[PDB]
């Protein structure tokens, strides 16, 4: 009763009387649990997340330059300098130039020349500091109650998990309980890394990479851009002039290098919640505390009718929908066998008992068929309902 | 001639009928010129000089630090900044210290630290570039007229020389004319060098040395000191705070290193005029236009006497002061000989005629006597005057 078509849908079966089992989850997939006489369970990672990591640093992937200003000195007349050179904010560079009498100079030789321009970032990425203690895990769980597919969204459990709350317990109405026990200490190493964001798109990458970026960068809080001479370059001088080049938006180059970095996204609602893809974790669960809600109920042996016919799962099992038109808190027998003689239920009933809980509503059923040809069987007496199946 | 007094004479003798001879002059020494029938001529450097050379650089050799500032950040939370960083006037440095809860720090690890201080040079040397074309030489020239020593400073001739006033001549009353040429374009390499200036003391050194000096420097005027790195150093941070050393006045170190440099001095009469001590020049002279003033005169044969006795020079020659009393415009015989028989003038007369120009006035004589014993003889008859001499 969950996990339609999931990219992996693997089974773990507990040893009988084993209070715990362990599982490793990856956000692509889910894992379903068999408990040898207790309702089957299933679990999956909705997300791992950080909220509002610290705004440590910004980097400009593009800038614009304006009002380039220049002056000069004849070779003997000391050395050129200009007000902006003494301050920042202007990415200044200075060098020697050839000059001669024909340039109006007093003498022939190396003069000196200085050039600077106001620098402003056009577009910038931002970086943010991960706190491991601010990591959250959010895990989905659902028990194979056979509830209507629509009801899954109101049935589904979710639990928060983090190092300060390493244990939690799910509860299921009449279906008992199960504890869950996430593992933080070896899941992820984000302490060595920044979150990085550009335009509604973001990645996680290690601090040392960010430190090594050739691009110019900015404090978390102020105006002093720090290394503009990586982005700007100056032509070799002509006799009294230099033209100064802004490199274009490095964005594509940068975004190409990040192509191997793990992707991250903002929430729509909390703009400061960052949700991280590619996450994986280990966890443990107490199986014992679950309950088979309706095993005592009346066996149907009656003319139920199908609502969605037996159809192949993404892997292995078959699924179907059925309801009872007139009945009770009731339960339905299910068998899968080589022959319509049905000598053994060769396959495994996955919802370990599909109780027809009410007159109101259909129930979902899931079965692992055997290899080769087999017959699906539901109900009892001459009133039983059946169809062919294979592997 | 004044060259009698100098600690070192070089002698050069012109070939008969030779229009020119050449000599090399160096400030601590002087030259005397002999020619077979021409009054002997002596020449010397007074000085070589530069006028108001242009400011290449200023260099500080001491500085004082004040208004020292600190800022810090908790280890993961960012990178420290301070407004004063953004202008060179504050001689910044940046570093990290560990911090932890003992520092009140909210987490354990390397906190970022920055610090600054207002920098001022306390005492600075200045540098100036050698315009080789602006070099001047001054040559002192004098003739062995045998004029009294008391008169030398009024008889002596001073000649200017300049890269584009490359020829000059001198005139001596009755003794005629002399003309001089010298290597104003070529005698020194010093366009490769700066004049170095401290308080009332100065040197000349090559540009490369100065440019290599590991000390903060300034150029033009008023601009920010461009190389704070060396004169200021900061301790390791301690107890999440820092304080800043300053190195001592490097003046002594610098003045020690300059011990190999050639020395320079200031004209008290002209703050722009610098005089360079230790230069040398190559020079050439026309002797042809000289004449021996008194040649036509009679001999006195009358009772002259020594105003000052025959006496040793610095140079193995000897000198005398003699006056004729009753007499005439007269040329007086002087002989150095083995015997009072005076068979041969064994040695060389340096003032090629001693002339008593008037009965009132002594005349000064130099001769180069032979090795060993000899007699100096002056005058004739029993009125003769004589003196023993040795080597």
């Amino acid at each position: 009763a969950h996990c339609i078509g999931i990219t992996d849908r693997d089974f773990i079966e507990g040893v009988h009387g084993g209070t715990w089992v362990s599982a490793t989850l990856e956000q692509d997939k889910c894992v379903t649990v068999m408990a040898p006489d207790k309702p089957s369970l299933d679990i999956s990672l909705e997300t791992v997340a950080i909220d509002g990591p610290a705004e440590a640093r910004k980097v400009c992937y593009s800038a614009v330059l304006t009002n380039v200003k220049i002056n000069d000195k004849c070779p003997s007349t000391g050395e050129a300098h200009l007000e902006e050179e003494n301050e920042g904010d202007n990415a200044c560079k200075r060098t020697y130039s050839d000059r001669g009498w024909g340039n109006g100079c007093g003498l022939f030789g190396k003069g000196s020349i200085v050039a600077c321009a106001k620098f402003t970032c056009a577009k910038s990425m931002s970086l943010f500091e991960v706190d491991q203690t601010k990591i959250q895990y959010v895990i989905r769980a659902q028990l194979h109650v056979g509830a209507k597919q629509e009801n899954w969204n109101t049935d589904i459990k979710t639990l928060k998990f983090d190092a300060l709350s390493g244990s939690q317990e799910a509860e299921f109405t009449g279906y008992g309980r199960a504890t869950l026990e996430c593992q933080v200490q070896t899941a992820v190493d984000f302490s060595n890394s920044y979150i990085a964001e550009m335009e509604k798109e973001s990645w996680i990458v290690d601090k040392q990479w960010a430190q090594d970026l050739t691009l110019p960068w900015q404090s978390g809080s102020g105006g002093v851009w720090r290394e503009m001479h990586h982005l700007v370059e100056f032509e070799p001088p002509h006799a009294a002039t230099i033209k100064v080049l802004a490199l274009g938006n490095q964005e594509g180059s940068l975004k190409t290098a990040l192509t191997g970095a793990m992707r991250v996204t903002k929430d729509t609602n909390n703009s400061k919640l960052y949700k991280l893809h590619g996450g994986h974790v280990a966890c443990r669960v107490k199986l014992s505390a679950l309950t088979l809600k309706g095993t005592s109920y009346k066996i149907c042996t009656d003319k139920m009718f199908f609502v969605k016919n037996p159809t192949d799962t993404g892997h292995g099992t078959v699924v179907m929908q059925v309801k009872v038109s007139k009945g009770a808190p009731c339960r339905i027998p299910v068998i899968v066998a080589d022959d319509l003689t049905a000598a053994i239920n060769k396959g495994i009933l996955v919802t370990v008992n599909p109780i027809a809980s009410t007159n109101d509503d259909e129930v979902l059923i899931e079965v692992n068929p055997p290899f080769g040809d087999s017959y699906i069987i539901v109900g009892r007496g001459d009133s039983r309902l059946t169809y062919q199946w294979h592997k | 001639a004044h060259c009698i007094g100098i600690t070192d004479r070089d002698f050069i003798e012109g070939v008969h009928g030779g229009t020119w001879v050449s000599a090399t002059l160096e400030q601590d020494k002087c030259v005397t010129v002999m020619a077979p029938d021409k009054p002997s001529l002596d020449i010397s450097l007074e000085t070589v000089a530069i006028d108001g050379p242009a400011e290449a650089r200023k260099v500080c050799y001491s500085a004082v630090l004040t208004n020292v500032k600190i800022n810090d950040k908790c280890p993961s939370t960012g990178e420290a900044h301070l407004e004063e960083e953004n202008e060179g006037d504050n001689a910044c440095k940046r570093t990290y210290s560990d911090r932890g809860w003992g520092n009140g720090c909210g987490l354990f690890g390397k906190g970022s630290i920055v610090a600054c201080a207002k920098f001022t040079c306390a005492k600075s040397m200045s540098l100036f570039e050698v315009d080789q074309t602006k070099i001047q030489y001054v040559i002192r020239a004098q003739l062995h007229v045998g004029a009294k020593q008391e008169n030398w400073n009024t008889d002596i001739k001073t000649l200017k020389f300049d890269a584009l006033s490359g020829s000059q001549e001198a005139e001596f009353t009755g003794y005629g004319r002399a003309t001089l040429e010298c290597q104003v374009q070529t005698a020194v390499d010093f366009s490769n060098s700066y004049i170095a200036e401290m308080e009332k003391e100065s040197w000349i050194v090559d540009k490369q040395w100065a440019q290599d000096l590991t000390l903060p420097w300034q150029s033009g005027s008023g601009g920010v000191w461009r190389e704070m790195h060396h004169l200021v150093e900061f301790e390791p941070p301690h107890a999440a705070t820092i304080k800043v050393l300053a190195l001592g006045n490097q003046e002594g170190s610098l003045k020690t290193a300059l011990t190999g440099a050639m020395r320079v001095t200031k004209d008290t009469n002209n703050s722009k005029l610098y005089k360079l001590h230790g230069g040398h020049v190559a020079c050439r002279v026309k002797l042809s236009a000289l004449t021996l003033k008194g040649t036509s005169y009679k001999i006195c044969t009358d009772k002259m006497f020594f105003v000052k006795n025959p006496t040793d020079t610095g140079h193995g020659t000897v000198v005398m002061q003699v006056k004729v009393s009753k007499g005439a415009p007269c040329r007086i015989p002087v002989i150095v000989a083995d015997d009072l028989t005076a068979a041969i003038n064994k040695g060389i007369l340096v003032t090629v005629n001693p002339i008593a120009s008037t009965n009132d006035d002594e005349v000064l004589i130099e001769v180069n006597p032979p090795f060993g014993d000899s007699y100096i003889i002056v005058g004739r008859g029993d009125s003769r005057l004589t003196y023993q001499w040795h080597k």
Partner: antibody
Amino acid sequence: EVKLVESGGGLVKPGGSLKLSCAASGFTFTNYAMSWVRQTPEKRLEWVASISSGHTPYYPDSVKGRFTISRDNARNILFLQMSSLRSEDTAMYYCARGDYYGSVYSAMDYWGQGTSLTVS
Amino acid sequence: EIRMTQSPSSMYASLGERVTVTCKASQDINSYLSWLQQKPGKSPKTLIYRANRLFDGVPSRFSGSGSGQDYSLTISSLEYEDMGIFYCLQYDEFPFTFGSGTKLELK
């Protein structure tokens, strides 16, 4: 006192030429930048040219190729080659230094008394 | 070629009055702008050099302000000694120019 004083105003035929000039005093004149400006009739004030402390000129297209500035260290004298002169260029000219660093790109402090140039 | 102007043709003004002028350009100049004053029959004088700060001797009677495209000068407690012509001036591109002129007159 820091001082400028213009010279070489007067009258000339159109297409003729003149020396506009000025003397500077009271400061290390070589280290400053220097600049020329005028007020025309119709009560407008207009830049015409400047030179760096480095001997280096800057010109508007109104005057580009007509004139040049020059100066000397020898006497701290400005010169401006009034040339190919044309009727609009009648004005009270002035010169007014520059800045401490020798930037042409600056405000400027002190103004000479100016002199009138006229053309028939 | 930066265009710029300040609007007023003149200010009629009186002893102790506060009066102002404002200038607007064609490009976002870096406050590399000055205001200049000229009483008649003599050369101009420069009051404020970078658009926020004065040269020596200019009294606290004057001040100025602005950013990017837009600038102003103000006079606090005017006197007749301050009357006459006024000009702005840009200087962060080489076609240096003064925009519109204006003047200050006694009422």
